[PDB]
Ligand binder design. Sequence first.
Ligand SMILES: CC[C@H]1OC(=O)[C@H](C)[C@@H](O[C@H]2C[C@@](C)(OC)[C@@H](O)[C@H](C)O2)[C@H](C)[C@@H](O[C@@H]2O[C@H](C)C[C@H](N(C)C)[C@H]2O)[C@](C)(O)C[C@@H](C)C(=O)[C@H](C)[C@@H](O)[C@]1(C)O
Ligand SMILES: CC[C@H]1OC(=O)[C@H](C)[C@@H](O[C@H]2C[C@@](C)(OC)[C@@H](O)[C@H](C)O2)[C@H](C)[C@@H](O[C@@H]2O[C@H](C)C[C@H](N(C)C)[C@H]2O)[C@](C)(O)C[C@@H](C)C(=O)[C@H](C)[C@@H](O)[C@]1(C)O
Ligand SMILES: [Cl-]
Ligand SMILES: [Cl-]
Lengths: 184, 185
Amino acid sequence: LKSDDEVLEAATVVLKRCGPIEFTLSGVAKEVGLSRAALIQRFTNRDTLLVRMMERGVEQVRHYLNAIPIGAGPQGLWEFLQVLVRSMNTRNDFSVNYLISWYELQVPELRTLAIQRNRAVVEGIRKRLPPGAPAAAELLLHSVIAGATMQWAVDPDGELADHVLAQIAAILCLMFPEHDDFQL
Amino acid sequence: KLKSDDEVLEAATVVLKRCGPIEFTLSGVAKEVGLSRAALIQRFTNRDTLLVRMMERGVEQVRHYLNAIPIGAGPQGLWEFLQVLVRSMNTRNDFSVNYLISWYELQVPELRTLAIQRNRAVVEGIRKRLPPGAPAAAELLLHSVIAGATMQWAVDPDGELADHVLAQIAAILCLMFPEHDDFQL
Ligand SMILES: CC[C@H]1OC(=O)[C@H](C)[C@@H](O[C@H]2C[C@@](C)(OC)[C@@H](O)[C@H](C)O2)[C@H](C)[C@@H](O[C@@H]2O[C@H](C)C[C@H](N(C)C)[C@H]2O)[C@](C)(O)C[C@@H](C)C(=O)[C@H](C)[C@@H](O)[C@]1(C)O
Ligand SMILES: CC[C@H]1OC(=O)[C@H](C)[C@@H](O[C@H]2C[C@@](C)(OC)[C@@H](O)[C@H](C)O2)[C@H](C)[C@@H](O[C@@H]2O[C@H](C)C[C@H](N(C)C)[C@H]2O)[C@](C)(O)C[C@@H](C)C(=O)[C@H](C)[C@@H](O)[C@]1(C)O
Ligand SMILES: [Cl-]
Ligand SMILES: [Cl-]
């Protein structure tokens, strides 16, 4: 496997499967089909590879959110938030995200990228707000996604998206009380 | 004389908040409470059993704390309760340890049940304080705002935790209770 991008994607697979503590160059090397020495020549060491991977994360969030088609009014916002929430993968071990997030906060380089990642998502929501959205509505919507996601991770009932989006629908009704119900 | 079980578990919880659940050891708790490692083994068997007892005490403390918050009336009484609840989270030391504690709980079924009980106690505590005319499932939305806004702050801190979270709580309460005044801290 050749490109920096192909290698960083394979390393991301490993990070999701093992978490950041058990993450190793050897495990990336075995995933991507390259020698560990090759990873070292291209990315210097474990810590530096983690940084490049998380840089690619923030890039991919921005790349992803920026091209999602924009619909009109509260209904467009609702559509966007559905796509956003459904984008989260719960198929293997969702709890690894909380270990990832914790680990990121301990390493200044990763912490800055984590901030950029959340800022990108908040700004992505902000740009989909129709006129008449309450002030700072983007912060509230991102909080509901993160908080309801946590609720479900601890105490799961049904699919993540259904738990989160029910709450999103509820807050959208409060933000746009003259709109028709938001269909989930 | 013997130190109480509550004193020992308190000391252990301080250690857990300092080192996190991966680095938590009997030796650390012993150093913290002035007791021998041997004495801790006698009373609490092992490190895993000690963590279960600490987390059982945690759920008890949550329930006791929520019961102790004065009960007001109306949307104002709910806002007052929420202010106390949010301000109850200690930010004296490294708040990010809470995310590790949460992750670890999810890995250990006995601890995960207790984390579920904790969140359920807080959700139910909010629910019992909802005035009539709060929207359906408002207690879940309010808990989500606290959790989500706290995580936003823990990743990207601007000022005090409570200030960041309560600005959003005030915002949603305005939406829930449009016929009410602005909610002031
Ligand atoms: C702690 C709990 C927090 O989770 C995380 O921070 C983990 C650690 C991220 O993965 C981190 C780390 C990592 C390696 O994925 C595990 C990386 O690939 C991503 C970009 O960021 C997640 C899952 C990201 O998902 C990514 O959302 C993109 C829009 C699409 C992408 N996917 C379709 C490709 C998906 O994975 C993303 C950006 O945070 C989702 C948005 C909705 C949020 O802001 C939500 C509210 C999160 O703050 C959160 C759930 O509260
Ligand atoms: C991950 C992020 C989550 O944090 C935790 O789960 C950590 C791990 C708990 O500590 C865990 C673990 C531990 C050891 O503390 C770190 C234990 O002592 C407490 C009870 O539970 C926190 C902090 C608890 O604080 C406690 O709130 C009580 C009302 C009063 C109590 N204390 C001041 C009287 C205070 O500690 C408590 C209950 O979760 C606060 C309520 C508001 C929540 O439900 C919020 C929304 C959380 O779910 C959260 C912030 O999203
Ligand atoms: Cl994902
Ligand atoms: Cl606390």
